[PDB]
Design goal:
The structure is cut from a larger assembly and holds two copies of chain A. The first copy, chain A, is α+β, with helices and mostly antiparallel strands. The interface between A and B is medium-sized, with 28 and 29 residues. The complex binds the ligand O=C(O)[C@H]1[C@@H](O)[C@H](O)[C@H](O)[C@@H](O)[C@@H]1O (2 copies). The site of one copy of the ligand O=C(O)[C@H]1[C@@H](O)[C@H](O)[C@H](O)[C@@H](O)[C@@H]1O has 10 residues of chain B, from loops. Chain B: Keywords: Glycosidase, Hydrolase. Chain B: It catalyses: a beta-D-glucuronoside + H2O = D-glucuronate + an alcohol; 4-methylumbelliferone beta-D-glucuronate + H2O = 4-methylumbelliferone + D-glucuronate.
């Protein structure tokens, strides 16, 4: 469970395994039987790690593959790591990985978007080359997060219920890292902030197999507070709060000392509180207004693979357009993104991979919550996905809210019985952040059965698109009516976590009609006018930052075209509309 | 009602009223009450006739208008027309027109796609200017061909609901004209061209309606008299006739003279000597099997909507000729007759279709709440069936003598699952055969009314299937699509043992979208998917034709399925070729003319 982000210290080294690996499909599904991990993969080819495997090859038969694929490389253990605790770590393997070091099985993970690792000290020798084999499986069933159904025809075909392509592979960094045989295994900080903002407290809890001391250092490396033992509270006079748009960070240096060994782990800490009060979202006791995007991890060639240039360029576009926030739609993002948000003061709604709990979007069993679909084991798997997300992200000050799912069908019998325990367990795992369950349009104010269990109303709305098609005048009436009915029903802060229309870049129309750039601008504008008239709306996240790949079908013109930007990051007209609205408002303040 | 195409003759003049007219919306619907026809339209603007009104103005509020609009111009009657029978003719007004000459109501017509006309002799004076007002209505209901529902919102604002996948363009789409005959005139002509098996003799029956003694002269393309006859009816014998053949279209001229004691009238009718017949699973033209290649089309272009235009007709025929197309279907309404004059002259084979699309509440195309029973008093009823019969009569009355027209399609993609379907269609099938016994009939078949489901195709002569396996279902999966397609065509061959024409196969293709994955919306998928259909067609002996959906990208109702319109074109709306145009060019110019390809 304990999952600290590897960082280089006087007591910790890292060796990235990113680069070219050997790669092989297993159409006969005989690689486990033939123990492929005991040899060089036969009939293999070069693949980039990190990256989705699907689009690296310009090959439809690989892109559409369902089953196991195999990655392998050789790596030299640094000579100096003799006597040291050596960990092998995968930041993310989509959706399942099993790992062998030479002929030793070392670890296994279900969940495509959070890290897994094993201590491999006993199975490697410092100064020698070792063989790493990974069996990666991209199949979804009713107990995976997200769910799906594999149909077999004779040949496997993956069915799934979410509007983004089922990219798979080693999407994020692989690495070896070291600790001493005494080490800091875990840290929780809780950051309290007086109402007047003129004092703050920092609770710590540490797990380590040796005596623990902590030093809190400011941005200038001046020690502002010190403590001892596994737990306690640091007092901070006149603290530099972590504020949206700035993101001042302290460093909590955790030392675990044995008589013989010592370990130093620096954790970035942003001093901020988050709370809902009535229909206001407060950060450091001040109302905040969310602007920005639903995103995806999606790009040409690399699929959902992490990439620094893309992270730099996309943050430069969000900065320029005046976005203050985003949501990790619809899975945990690369941790680098949360390190970025921490440092630049970007506000994040951190979401699990639990999209698709919904059989009514655009074969399938009769009852959504039943033994044959979302069941007891599904709910366990969902709890595990929430635990892994919070265990990874609990200390990121940029994360202001947990979204435990996107667009579940809450009409059917058993929805509330499924969600209640998940809402409760989320609050116990992290009491410091509000929780949400992002709401599908047809589960309206008069229909939805679970919104009372959550703190903030995150509504996905597309009136004037899938319904009242091309009619802004009717869409505006229906939208305003529904937001006010939500305000009346629950008196929670409302974030519109999804509003957008498919827009084909370069399609221009004097009739302002669907798919045109001019429609995208008129439709976003109508939404904005309505949001500004409703006092409960504390945010707006446009769907989507950029055009992204989907499953093939008649609704998707080479993918999802709701982007503000093209997949190659070129702006549509609507990017300039958002630039003016979001840079023209006062930072973090509801427009008028 | 008799409908000869106006032609200039020693006895007949024409004056086109095409040009700029005055135009006005009537948002309050007070134009009949205020008798707008009695003066200049009040708040008017210039509009081009012919043309759809919708896209001339770059104005969404006009494009999306439902109700009456008003057209008006002034025109001089030629001085020399004194003593002549003077007719005012509209080749087509979509969907309804009422016409006034000064303050006299002269005409009314329902049906957006065939001509109407009135004798206006008594209401004009030769050498003076008259005012022509037209009230044009674009509303569809359950008794219009095609059908629809007007939804009135809580504020009284009208929005047209309709069940077909093309934009409900309206206006004066085709030429308006005054024309003369003498007071004795040839009012009607039916020819039937019979052709011996050996093709070495032919007979030409004639029947004429006119208020005078009738003689005929049949002249060959060199203007040499090959046969003469007398009386309102009879048979001309033609030795070693130059048959009208697909790819050539040799035409004779049947000159009909009506002579009274005092005056006379000469009408030249172009006649192509050709027989059409179904035998088993073969479509025979001049006793020889024919294989159809080409397109489902639309009347659709930038700015003018469904308006007729000679440059478009010349350019599009040059594209069909280049690509090797030998045929098309008038999807989904009668086309401008100039198209059938072109087909006659160049030997292009045409499936002539009525405007009866939309008889189907279970598609995703078109556009409030649909009625639950398609064939009921509150939807397709007795009055609908009457209106459909009238649409078939008017089409045949116009097109009965075009040798290019080889088959009548009485509708496109009706829902034939309910019991009502056969009850509605059976009498329509029978009446079509009585109206013209010289051509086979069809009713074009929707994909979900499969060989195991459909209830009416036995009543027709040719199986015209509209199929899109690998698109709307088995999306992007050529392998499954191919199995399902082959299985269904063979099940149709077993069931009815008719000739099969695939009258629709196509996939949305965004010009310039390219993919190494050959996936939906790409130029590459369009090519791979048409190729898979071709391979299957060539393995099925009953398939006698292939008409690609569609010749060119065209406008539709706005919705989530349509990326600025229908992108199943082989060409873009501005007539630029997609990669698939070159695929079709190779298959269609590489086969033997009119002959089923081989594996
Ligand atoms: O359809 C769309 O463009 C979106 C989809 O991409 C998104 O995942 C949902 O949360 C919502 C909308 O349905
Ligand atoms: O959907 C489509 O592209 C076509 C449509 O345009 C056509 O009118 C029908 O006959 C058939 C298909 O439904």
């Amino acid at each position: 469970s304990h999952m600290l982000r590897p960082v280089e210290t006087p007591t910790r080294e890292i060796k990235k395994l990113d680069g070219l690996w050997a790669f092989s499909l297993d159409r006969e599904n005989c690689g486990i039987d033939q123990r492929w991990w005991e040899s060089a993969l036969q009939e293999s080819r070069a693949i980039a790690v990190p990256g989705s495997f699907n689009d690296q090859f310009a090959d439809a038969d690989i892109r559409n593959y369902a089953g196991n694929v195999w990655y392998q490389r050789e790596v030299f253990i640094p000579k100096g790591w003799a006597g040291q605790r050596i960990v092998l770590r995968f930041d993310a393997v989509t959706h399942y990985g099993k790992v062998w070091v030479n002929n030793q099985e070392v670890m296994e993970h279900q969940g495509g978007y959070t890290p897994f690792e094993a201590d491999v000290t006993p199975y490697v020798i410092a100064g020698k080359s070792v063989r790493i084999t990974v069996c990666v499986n991209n199949e979804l069933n009713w107990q995976t997060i997200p769910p799906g159904m594999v149909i077999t025809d004779e040949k496997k075909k993956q069915s799934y219920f979410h509007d983004f392509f089922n990219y798979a592979g080693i999407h994020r960094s692989v690495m070896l890292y070291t600790t001493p045989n005494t080490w800091v295994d875990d840290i929780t900080v809780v950051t309290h902030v007086a109402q007047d903002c003129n004092h703050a407290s920092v609770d710590w809890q540490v797990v380590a197999n040796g005596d623990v001391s902590v030093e809190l250092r400011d941005a200038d490396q001046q020690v502002v507070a010190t403590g001892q033992g596994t737990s306690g509270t640091l007092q901070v006079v006149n603290p530099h709060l972590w504020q949206p748009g700035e993101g001042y960070l302290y460093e909590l240096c955790v030392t675990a000392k044995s008589q013989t060994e010592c370990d130093i782990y620096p954790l970035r800490v942003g001093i901020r509180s988050v709370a809902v009060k009535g229909e206001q979202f407060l950060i450091n006791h001040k109302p905040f207004y969310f602007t920005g995007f639903g995103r995806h991890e999606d790009a040409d060639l690399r699929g959902k693979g992490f990439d620094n240039v893309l992270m730099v360029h996309d943050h430069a576009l969000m900065d320029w357009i005046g976005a203050n926030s985003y949501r990790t739609s619809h899975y945990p993002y690369a941790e680098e993104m949360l390190d970025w948000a921490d440092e630049h003061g970007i506000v994040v709604i951190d979401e699990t991979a639990a999209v698709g709990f919904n059989l009514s979007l655009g074969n399938k069993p009769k009852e959504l919550y039943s033994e044959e679909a979302v069941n007891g084991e599904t709910q366990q798997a969902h709890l595990q996905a929430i635990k892994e997300l919070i265990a990874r992200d609990k200390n990121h000050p940029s994360v202001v809210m947990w979204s435990i799912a996107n667009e579940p069908d809450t009409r059917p019998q058993g929805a509330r019985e499924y969600f209640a325990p998940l809402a409760e367990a989320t609050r116990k795992l992290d009491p410091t952040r509000p929780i949400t369950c992002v709401n599908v349009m047809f589960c309206d104010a008069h229909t939805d059965t679970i919104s009372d269990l959550f703190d903030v109303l995150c509504l996905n709305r597309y009136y004037g698109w899938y319904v009242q098609s091309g009619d802004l005048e009717t869409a505006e009436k229906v939208l305003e009516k529904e937001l006010l009915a939500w305000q009346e029903k629950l008196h929670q802060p409302i974030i519109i976590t999804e509003y957008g229309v498919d827009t084909l870049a370069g399609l221009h129309s004097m009739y302002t009609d669907m798919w045109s750039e001019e429609y995208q601008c008129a439709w976003l504008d109508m939404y904005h006018r309505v949001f500004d008239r409703v006092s409960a709306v504390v945010g707006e996240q446009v769907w989507n930052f950029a055009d992204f790949a989907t499953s093939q079908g008649i609704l998707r013109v080479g993918g999802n075209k709701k982007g503000i930007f093209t997949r190659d990051r070129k702006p549509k007209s609507a990017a300039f509309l958002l630039q003016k609205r979001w840079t023209g408002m006062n930072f973090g303040e509801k427009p008028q």
